[model samples]
Target: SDGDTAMKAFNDTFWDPNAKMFWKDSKREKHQDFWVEAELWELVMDAYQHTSDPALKAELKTQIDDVYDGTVAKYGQDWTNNPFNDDIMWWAMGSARAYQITGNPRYLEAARDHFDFVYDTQWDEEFANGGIWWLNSDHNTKNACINFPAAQAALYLYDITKDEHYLNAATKIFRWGKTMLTDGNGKVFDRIEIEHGAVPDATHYNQGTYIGSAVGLYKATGNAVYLDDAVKAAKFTKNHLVDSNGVLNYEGPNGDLKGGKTILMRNLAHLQKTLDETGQYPEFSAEFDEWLAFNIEMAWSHQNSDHIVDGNWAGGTYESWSSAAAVQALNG
Candidate 1:
């Protein structure tokens, strides 16, 4: 019910009824003017599942058509305009979901189009990696953020297509991330970069991505190593990133980035998956429950006059990415 409410709110606010293109912001102002087309499809699936609204179902189909029609600037047929970091990967994911629900060949074709984009643009020969890149430009770094979502997208693709390549890509990237990014102490960090004679500090998002990546790998490959790696990363985050009271620490060293509860919530949800798989994540289940309660409490407290969760939340909301993750956590 909570998820339904939040998705409906987003549908009403960000969805442009006239243009049929979802905007990137709560306000009408054109932030991320190019926009992420993937979210539009994901939200469509959510709305379709929760509410049997005929208008929403039709709008979803119309939005898919608009992308092919060049109505949205960043998406056009035969152009493949996905230059953003994670856009195409998410497009593939959402399109796969739509395909499963509707058996629509167009959605499957749309997913394949993005998959082709990922293969053509982001497949790193130098790194011997088949995963997608963080960005499509000159700054094409392949990080956990890119790979984890790519793995997820690939999983969806594999589910629909039954293609081995997609599953292989997902497994390979998971192995690469576990080997490269996880620190000696079992704590997962961001990518190792040496720039300007100095290495930057690690980040919360990195570990969060690893948690999901490892779990995805485990589910896809049935490898115990991925599950164990996820467990250790979860414990490491609980020790360092999570506060004594279970609230997460977001601030990283050297003014890098603060630990946000959203990231921690995401990581915890993945760890919860690990627990469900192996049934041994007992160390932090109580802590996760406590912290998540606080998260909900804090979110309700920060509700705006319009009753929407506003701004960059410190540790609040049963909406957005955090809410999605919390739902996964409870499910686990």
Candidate 2:
């Protein structure tokens, strides 16, 4: 009664079959924000990766198609026309995993087109140290939203195509992001602007991506340092970003912030999986295993009578984005 059940609760509460998209709230209100849907798409990939059951596999495949086609129906298939680079980057990452799960060439094509659009247009060495532009409309700032996800997207492409060029691209983006965007303690700052300095405020989603890229790179090349970086970042996030009880702090009622845990949990789960596959760092492995379980169950304890998880895991508030975040831990 865990992974699959939690996903169904989330889907039942938020999925709008008529629109073929998740709704904005448990109330079955407006269309869910596109970026939130993109993350949900990745959560589907996370759940899909862990299961071999035929019916669930079929179910998730349909969910994937609905989310994609619903997006195309809403925004059209040509994602390059979108001005926000991170918006396209997220969907590209989702599309990349969609390709992996289904082997659908259309998914791969969308992934490539969007990823290349960001890489070709937004990346610039002439920018502050180097990273992708946050958007085409505004060119002065480079944010965590684009670079970490772009790097991960490059790795996904590398995985599918078995191309060293994608590998090289991933490595370059990771190094640039780490050097320019993070502090000595492995806490990731929000962005780097042209005239001003590094914008401060480390969020869970950014740290998660930092951890995600670091762990994925370690897997890609058997590099101990990348593993070390992931561990350091995870430790920092646990120590700094949580409540006195060590639950993740309520990032705010903002839809984007509410969903950060969904992104973080899957990557920390990735860290655990990689730790298992490599058979290294057993001490931290055991510690993190316990730590992750603590947070997940604590959130489960706070789930409402209607089975909706509160965004503030430390309390009482149900939101579509927050509930999605909580379920992902089990799915992860």
Candidate 3:
């Protein structure tokens, strides 16, 4: 019921008929035309996986096709010219998932190309011990956001193609992230500034991707340590990052941080699924389900008459990024 309701609201509020993609906000006035739009398309794919509704699936397929066709037409095959490593990695992750869903060689090839470019150009041994820089031009700041997702993209390829190089790269990136970005208590830091030192922001999305990297490694190697780290990171995130109501806090609903909490929610579901398969930590599944339900209910309560969902899950004015994030979490 929550899934259907949330999906309806998301479609009603955000979908742009002319653009054949979601707008940047509830007003349907502006197209994001950036990496956030890429993330939104990924959310649409995730939503499609959760439902069997034919109309919903058809709509999602059209949106995905439009993004792929439009991006290639504008950016060409390499998908280059973007300055932000994190932005490119976001598209790579989304594209990688598209490959997984559709079994399309073009999507896989695009993901591999983008990921290889980012990995070759963005990662550096000279920065904060070791990690990927946040941007190509600015090599001083090493961020969990870029590094962890890059690891995820690598691992996804590894799983798809059984390439040892992807596995090895993912391993190195995960270790570097753990070494440079994790705090004493297993909480992941946001970034490390080569000049100033580590910035201990520890946002929800950072924690999510950190957990995701660990889980990815665990799946790849069947190593207990990676799973252990994932569990620890998940615990730290759940305890420290959430409000009393169990909704994620910090990185407020706007700009790039909009709907970030849902990223954590998505990875938490990943962790739960892994734990479920292993017959480990049964309690986590119950806790996660309850917490997730609270978040979805809160998000639904915030929706307006126009089906606009807010950045704040509790209640507020609506943004398309926030609504898309809520839709992802609700479907999860």
Candidate 4:
């Protein structure tokens, strides 16, 4: 997929070195959503894993530190001032993953400390069946965005520290998310609202994180049930969240949704890797790999000759989120 080239162009086009984050557009008009940078952080880690080029590896490493340094410079050490819990969760996940890759003590500290803040503040017993809230000021909704990422972060912490407390948090959060945010058919809702009940809006990023949490649980516990849950959600994402030609949907040409397929593919890649490592589902792995390969081909073919692929996987120019999506999609 030549993800290396796309990442280079992505950095040149989207990254503002002084700002130390990806801007939303090539014009560098604004930084992307807080959570998007976290996903992009994970994408950088994925690129680091696959690339053998020493120079490219150095670039990713610097970028990893840059993201952390810039965030601390801009947002301070404590992030509870942010209104959205999911935003913090995304960075915690990114920090933890980066810690794994870099073995940086500060990354571990940020991931663990921020996640503890999230658990203490976001998870509420008096909430609707006890789940994480999407917004601090607004209790109108509980979302897969926060719940699944929280579980995933907890699992990551558990793996790193061997803390049963983290494992317990992961299980408790996963159970609540599964109970409230899904239809039990492997179809997940975007959120469950206060009065409106289930807002099963777009089927995109949430599906990825749900699959991610399920797969994380599977890895942590060696539970077949988590594997089945992951498989079912993956099935729904494939069968229901596609275009007429069966490629992943473009999501959008703008806004946060533009980059969703990136996350979707990232988690799917994880699922495929797990299936391969565990010898659990060869047929499913083959099936998913074929799909990813085809989509990679389509997206790469559709990008600018310079490899500045945008949000629309079907075709077009570039933006930070969409182009970053292409990078993650290609890496996947």
* Alpha-carbon local distance difference test for all models: 0.56, 0.85, 0.78, 0.83
Candidate 2 clashes between residue pairs 3 or more apart in a chain or in different chains? none
List, residue by residue over 66-86, the lDDT tens digit for candidate 3.
Answer: 776655655566656787888
lDDT of 4 by residue, 1-332 (tens): 37788788788878788988878786667777777878877888888887878989988988888987777777886777899998888999998998988898988998989898889877887767699888877778888888898999999999999989999999999998888889887898888888778887756788998999999999898779999999989888888888888788877634778778888888888898888888887887788778878878888777776668766677532577667767887565
Q: Across residues 44-140, which tens digit of lDDT does each residue of candidate 2 receive? A: 7777766667798788888888888888898899877778899999999999988888888999999998888889878899867678899888798
Report the Cα lDDT for candidate 3: 0.78
TM-score of each: 0.72, 0.96, 0.92, 0.95
The residue ranges of model 3 lying beyond 4 angstroms of the native Cα positions read: 72-77
- Model 3 residue 142 CA deviation (Å) reads 0.9
The Cα RMSD of model 4 versus the native structure comes to: 1.7
- Report the lDDT of model 4 for residue 74: 74
- Clashing residue pairs in candidate 1, if any? 249-259, 250-258, 250-259, 250-260, 251-258, 251-259, 299-317
User: For this target, which candidate reaches the highest lDDT against the unseen true structure?
Assistant: 2
TM-score of candidate 4 to 2 decimals:
0.95
Q: Rank the candidates by TM-score, best first.
A: 2, 4, 3, 1
Q: In candidate 3, what residue range of length 10 has the lowest lDDT sum? A: 308-317
Comparison by TM-score, 3 against 4, better one = 4
As for lDDT, the candidate ahead, 1 or 3, is 3
Per-prediction tally of clashes:
7, 0, 0, 1
